[PDB]
Ligand binder design. Structure first.
Ligand code: FDA
Lengths: 980, 979
């Protein structure tokens, strides 16, 4: 509204006038930090080096680590900027100085002394406790107890504090109305397993500790603010606030943070206000724009979720002014904290509040300590009511906080950068951001092949959504109404029953029988092969684009049954909810990706450029493919190998693993729904001891795709190499076998990241993945600290049925797996020393304890042999060279990981840690189609990589047709001829 | 210059006297004019129509005709308005079109039609139509047709008054010219005419030409020696020179020179100087040239310099330039202007006037049936016109028709421009030198990593005197180098052993080329150890650097091309061309795999998610065993070894025993390239001693093998075993046998099918995995195809490969000879022998060139790879059975089909499922990049050497995935999916 807007702009102009050209320290080019940020803002490579250096800085605890990282990040002295061992000293002192700029102290007593100084200068505070990520219950308790310690100290001090001057109200309160003690707590720091996948358990665990802090806050009439973290926990945190508020409906000093950069926030704010009115309670909202913009955008893109934040900066500004107005209009029920360093934003709030004649006791202004100093002083002068967000504590998390402040101040879109570094025009800085949104929305208004959109991975299940959370228990119940069926063979489009039945049961509850599976003898396998062979000529002659269309239809059929198909996997093979869904999305990805790959490869290409001649190079299928599939990714890998064979023009005889035969039947259902011609896909579960060699040895098999154990894979390779009478082809092997995968934890690893990634890599789906981390190789100097945190986190996790989302892992695949794994755990406990062995539920279930064993060395059996269960070996390496040597000390080379922030060590790992899939600074499991084509060599496979652009070629053979186009002295000229 | 402008004005003005004084294909009222018009408007149609006319004379049944009509022109709705009835429509029209260009189908009709033309004031030069000469019987028929014609003409000419002239002998044409004038195609006189055997070709052609010439002289006639494709130009010049000197006083012998050849300025200068030196006179018929598209294509296919000008005006300019040179030399050189181009004719006329040339020193010639108003106008303006008049069988008459239609309707044709186009006369009569400069100026407006794009190495080119002389010289030089002992080469050191095996010349086994040290298991083990020790540093060597060694090796080989070829002539009995092609293929592999590794050597980002980088790249495997064949001893050895090496593996190489010296060439080439020690190790040895040891060794990660199915299958079976300490599952790269068929369809062009089949079967005496060992011939063309194939076979000679007069020679060694002969005997009990050549007496592993018919798919020689000069002929009842029979073996390596049926060609492309299918050419001689080579079934494991998938087989892929987000920030990368 032009009138209000003009008052806002003039208010903003006065503000800029009052500042007198002063710059915040970060933009003071006479200071070292100003120089560092100046160069960071001019040179993106330096910015990345400098900011990553500050991130790793607190782990550089020896002279050697420090000296080496300085050289690795910034180069030799002669090549550093001028503003930049004496060098160790100058860098250390300047970085520590920058971090102290944003922190009120390292101890409670220091924090308190400094806050009282702040009061004497007219500033109120909200205190925050710095901390590393909470990875255990002990860490959650230390964090909780620090707030209690802080509150007990403030309790003794606040009586001696005169209330900050206000225009009215109570002289014992700040500005006449605000409680003198105000603290902010990060909710997920109160529960190390906070996850919307276990929504209720997460709310309760956080609520219980928040309640303890809150009672102490109430005891001294203080204010508690529940801070808002990443989008993943937003709904959990809102529910925590609501419940705590209702437990103390008469206590007014409880706040929640809401983030204006979220598209959800208009609705979330309106819902919260309606909720408060409904319940006749009052609330307090600290509105911020939001702290995790880059993270949310990246995470959403990585999982093919809708980006939850606005992506044009002015949209967040516009959203802020809009939502601030809403809060102010509702000042009767909603107290407001304006949390922004943007003068336009601040000015907007001030003018809107004056216009709505909001009482001053219903709104205050807040800024981050040590930041935008002239804005802070300007707020004091014009508004009077200004509160500093004041973190205190250890320098280790202090450095992480510093990095976030540097990122915030130096961002391209940063109001502070634009005002104080870039000399932006005031009129542009102060313009209505709604106007800004239109102009940039308008400017912004300015690829696949063959009519198909490009490949994108199917969206992962998203438990921030209530509907996704509710879908699993519903679809599991539906599956339970479908139990007890008999599953026949499927050959040449018909069901063939045998009289050899094997039950398939729930590994978490073996008395629960899911169905009975018919077993194929050699007779039926031979029939299936004969059917595939008869179907092959017509299928081979089918246009590749038409073959791809069948995979696309199968993908659509699967997509429509996504939760149903997932639920079957939860019960049949003990997949956790997320593990099951990811198995189904991966199956979908293979279908979408291989369809596209066949379309790409299906067009014959001209080769050579000589005139009078046309050479066309193209591919043809081999014949009948045996597909022998594992139980651990029962839909994904089955569908991957089968659809790859099918789309390339081969016909398939498919043997699922016995214990996941129902999932294998899903391929029958999906390919039938797609209308696949009969005989192209045949489903023949059977006993390996009866028909295993028969299927592999058969003369009409031309290709064998196998995923499973090395022993079986090697046997197949040996038997398949023989050419029997009537055998048309040398048999082609496509094989992925075991791994004994290591993750290296280097001295400078970020343990906040390493610990949960190692735990998930080792124990996700009970460790039953060929990619699972079974060896964690830890550098000497960080060993004790890493292990303490790894074991403490493991202790917080629960083992139990996979249908219950509160359990981290559950039973292993079957009775034989359980016995094999337990034997390996006993072997390991005699080779090394047990560090952790979890409780398991009493009663039925193939439960193996989550097990961590230290003291492991490369000559030990559990350092060498694939266990395929929740048994983690911890190995202590004396130096990085030994770590690499130990990583490479097995006969396998499937996956590997390394957590390190040393460019030199990462480079050595890229070169020498020669696994098929090496992961840097993240878990080594969860490979995605296209992004991480999966497979290795050594004893881990034959160098074929599923989900990659070389894969389909392995299912075909190339052919060339060469035509002499010259007749009677003339040949047609072709576009690409070498001519004259 | 100023003089230039004045003469041009006279030429332009003369051009208009021709146009004022002034064909049936451009007449849009006649059916042909309509068919031609649509051909000139729609190129797709032109191609169909011309190819249809080409195949037309093979369409001998109602079924063939009807189906080809449908396949070429679509259904009676698809085809245009000027188009069973259609069968009748096309037949009469096409036959009528062909008759327009020939003066008769018999000698009597021809002679009667020539006499008509005489009374109409036209002289003639008579030519005999014929299919390609493929045998001695055919060359004799062609020869005797000329003698028969001359005998007929001899009785008529005394009755002819000479064409009216300005004076002289009234019994002679125009007072001076012989009434009888004939033209002969020299290569039609010898079915094996080939500059590779230069002297033999000259003599064989010369002997028949002399016989014709004697008869010509007996009636005081004129003999013109026509000029054919560039391949035979030097042969034909030499035939003309020898015959001329044999009858130095007889003035009525002419040669054709082609102005489209860049060589022609010098060839004409040389010929004129030659005539003055020998004090003889000559006659030249200057033409522009009949084989333009062919010469351009052929040159590009063999990486030779294109021998013709490629801007049409350059040929016109050359013609006027060369006609002037002849006319300046009119005292010694009689001139026949042979062009239908009015500018060209007017230029000759005004130059002759400018140089005051007497009329008895030049005449004008045009082809019969063509440029009638030019022949009308030239007769009236120029006065002395001779029609080139072919006569004979309708079959070659149709092929001649195709050429005339091609000439008349070419975009750059002076005739097409003059009429159908309605062009400005100013542009048509323009000095072609001015056109040249403009077009050259217009024309005055790729590789990777600084390297030129790949091109195949130029093939040996025996049109050149230096290439012809190089082989005898280099064979001699190799013979000064015999008698050496060749050691193992391990870890950069020569290692001698006490076990020596001689290598001898298969065409002369008493000639011993050297002694080869054999490696025991201990030496093999040492070489594997050396390779393994060199591997980590080699693996860590930049792909671009590794590729550089291959490029150095390729330059090293390129500098020794003739020397390297000569060793193969002597050590394994390669013919000259076969030997040189073996070395160029080796060079091609080096150049191609170097480029392929550079392309594949860069890690590529995969996926597009932000906060993440995935890089996909390749790693070598380790030690590669390379087990090489003797039949392509440099090419395939170098291909398999350089591929393994460039991809970062280290090689232990076992050459075949009988080509161990060729194996040593790899040692020499890699050493000259400076390859690091241990990366390539040379260990010849006895299979019975060290074969399994090498294959079984646990330090071996890859085996590259080319050879027999039996040995290949054993290797595959043994390598599948993982032994203690074996790091990888062994990768197999294998090319094994073939039992390759060529199908000869009913409508096949037999002039092409016959020599290509003969070459495919007996080139390098059948010792190629790609060789044709089965020719599957359609029922209705069987008897005719076999007669010509057998008759051509009979004309070839078996003997030592160092003598280029021989087609094929001795097989590889004693063992091969015994094995092949056992198969021949087996074959002769299974079928019936059609041909079995003589072979030289005395020493040498000679097996006769052998052709056997009555063969069916159940027969052993229809199934088992013989690897020798034994060709099975199989008679198929229809095309479906031909395809079935072609597919009836356990092999699928190469195959060929001669057919001009779109439907049959489509069926073959789909169903004749070999690794390399060839259409209308031989099925041998695959080239790098153009024909990546290899197959499946029992012929291999689907790896194709010389193609873009091949290097991946020697490596394994790796992916590195990095989470780039720290503390909530990640660098934005170019190809990120972002906002
Ligand atoms: C007292 C107090 C307490 C807290 C916080 C701040 C203060 C002052 N913060 C941090 C807060 O989110 C952060 O400081 C502000 O977003 C900074 O924005 P300004 O108005 O200062 O600056 P400025 O006006 O320059 O705004 C920058 C903001 O715009 C947004 N943005 C940047 N690029 C964008 C784009 N391309 N598209 C759309 N939006 C874009 C981001 O939110 C970014 O922070 C927070 N944060 C949080 O999430 N939870 C919390 O509990 C707290 N706690």
């Amino acid at each position: 509204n032009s009138e209000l807007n003009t008052k806002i702009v003039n208010r903003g102009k006065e503000f800029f006038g009052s500042i007198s050209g002063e710059k915040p320290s970060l933009f003071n080019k006479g200071a070292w930090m100003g120089k560092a940020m100046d160069w960071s803002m001019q040179n993106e490579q330096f910015k990345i080096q400098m900011f990553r250096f500050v991130d790793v800085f607190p782990s550089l605890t020896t002279s050697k680590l420090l000296t080496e990282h300085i050289r690795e990040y910034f180069g030799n002295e002669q090549d550093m900027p001028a503003f930049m061992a004496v060098l160790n000293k100058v860098l250390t002192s300047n970085i520590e100085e920058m971090a102290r700029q944003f922190i009120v102290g390292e101890t409670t007593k220091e924090a308190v002394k400094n806050l009282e100084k702040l009061r004497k200068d007219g500033f109120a505070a909200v205190v925050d406790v710095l901390g590393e990520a909470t990875l255990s219950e002990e860490e959650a308790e230390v964090y909780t107890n620090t707030y209690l310690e802080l509150l007990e100290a403030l309790k003794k001090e606040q009586g001696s504090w005169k209330g900050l001057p206000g225009k009215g109200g109570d002289p014992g309160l700040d500005w006449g109305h605000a409680p003198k003690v105000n603290i902010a707590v990060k909710p997920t720091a109160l529960f190390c397993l906070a996850n919307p996948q276990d929504f209720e358990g997460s709310v309760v665990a956080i609520l219980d500790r928040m309640r303890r802090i809150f009672k102490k806050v109430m005891e001294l009439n203080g204010f508690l603010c529940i801070d808002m973290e990443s989008y993943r926990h937003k709904e959990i945190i809102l529910e925590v606030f609501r419940r705590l508020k209702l437990e103390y409906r008469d206590y007014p000093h409880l706040g929640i943070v809401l983030q204006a950069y979220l598209k959800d926030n208009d609705k979330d704010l309106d819902d919260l206000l309606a909720w408060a009115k409904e319940h006749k309670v009052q609330i307090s909202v600290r509105l911020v724009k939001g702290a995790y913009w880059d993270y949310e955008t990246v995470k959403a893109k990585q999982n093919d979720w809708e980006v939850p934040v606005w992506t044009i900066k002015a949209e967040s500004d516009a959203a802020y002014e809009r939502q601030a107005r809403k809060i102010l209009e509702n000042h009767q029920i909603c107290h407001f904290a304006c949390a922004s360093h943007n003068i336009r934003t601040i000015s907007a709030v001030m003018e809107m509040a004056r216009e709505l004649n909001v009482p001053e006791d219903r709104y205050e202004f807040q800024v981050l300590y040590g930041m935008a100093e002239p804005v802070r002083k300007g707020i004091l002068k014009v508004a009077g009511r200004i509160r500093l967000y004041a973190p205190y504590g250890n320098m280790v998390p202090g450095m992480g906080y510093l990095v976030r402040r540097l990122l915030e101040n130096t961002a391209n879109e940063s109001f502070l950068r634009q005002s104080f570094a870039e000399d932006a025009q005031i009129e542009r800085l102060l313009e209505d951001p709604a106007v800004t949104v239109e102009r940039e929305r308008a400017a912004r208004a300015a690829k696949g092949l063959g009519g198909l959109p490009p490949f994108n991975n199917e969206a992962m299940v998203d438990f921030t959504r209530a509907d996704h959370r509710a879908a699993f228990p519903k679809h599991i119940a539906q599956v339970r109404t479908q139990l007890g069926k008999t599953y026949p063979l499927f050959i040449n489009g018909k069901e063939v029953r045998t009289n050899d039945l094997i039950p398939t049961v729930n590994p978490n509850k073996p008395s629960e029988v899911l169905g009975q599976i018919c077993q194929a003898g050699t007779t039926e396998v031979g029939d299936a092969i004969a059917a595939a062979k008869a179907a092959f000529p017509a299928w081979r002659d089918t246009d590749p684009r038409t073959r791809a269309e069948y995979l696309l239809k199968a993908a659509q059929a699967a997509r429509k049954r996504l939760f149903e198909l997932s639920a079957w996997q939860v019960l049949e093979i003990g997949k956790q909810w997320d593990q099951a869904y990811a198995d189904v999305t991966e199956a979908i990805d293979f279908l979408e990706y291989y369809a596209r790959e066949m379309i790409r490869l299906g067009q014959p290409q001209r080769v050579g450029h000589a005139p009078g001649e046309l050479n066309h190079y193209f591919y043809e299928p081999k014949g009948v493919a045996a597909v022998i599939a594992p139980w651990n990714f029962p839909l994904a890998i089955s569908m991957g190998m089968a659809s790859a064979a099918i789309v390339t023009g081969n016909c398939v005889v498919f043997k699922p693993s016995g214990i996941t035969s129902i999932i294998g039947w899903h391929l029958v259902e999906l390919f039938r729904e797609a209308g696949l011609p009969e005989g192209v896909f045949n489903f023949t579960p059977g006993r390996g001891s009866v028909m295993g060699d028969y299927l592999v040895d058969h003369p009409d098999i031309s290709l064998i795709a196998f995923t499973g154990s090395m022993e079986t894979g090697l046997r197949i390779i040996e038997r398949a190499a023989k050419v029997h009478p009537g055998q048309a082809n040398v048999k082609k092997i496509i094989s992925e076998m075991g791994g004994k995968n290591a993750i290296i934890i280097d001295d400078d690893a970020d343990l906040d990241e390493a610990v949960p990634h190692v735990l998930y890599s080792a124990f996700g789906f009970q460790g039953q993945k060929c990619s699972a981390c079974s060896r964690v190789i830890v550098l000497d100097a960080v060993y004790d600290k890493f292990i303490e945190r790894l074991v403490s986190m493991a202790k917080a996790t629960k083992v139990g049925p996979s249908e219950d989302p509160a359990n981290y892992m559950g039973a292993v695949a079957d009775d034989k797996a359980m016995k094999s794994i337990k034997e390996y755990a006993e072997i390991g406990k005699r080779e090394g020393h047990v560090l952790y062995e979890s409780p398991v539920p009493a009663g039925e279930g193939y439960f193996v304890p989550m097990t961590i064993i230290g003291g492991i060395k490369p000559e030990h059996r559990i350092a060498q042999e694939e266990i395929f269960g929740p048994v983690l070996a911890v190995m202590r390496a004396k130096d990085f060279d030994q770590a690499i040597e130990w990583a490479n000390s097995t006969q396998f080379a499937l996956t590997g990981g390394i957590f390190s922030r040393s460019p030199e060590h990462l480079a050595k790992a890229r070169r020498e840690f020669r696994v098929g899939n090496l992961y840097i600074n993240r878990n080594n499991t969860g490979a995605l189609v296209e992004r991480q084509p999966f497979g290795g060599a050594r004893m881990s496979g034959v160098g074929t990589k599923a989900g990659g652009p070389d894969y389909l070629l392995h299912f075909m053979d190339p052919r060339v047709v060469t035509e002499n186009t010259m007749r009677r002295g003339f040949a047609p000229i072709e576009e690409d001829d070498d001519w004259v």
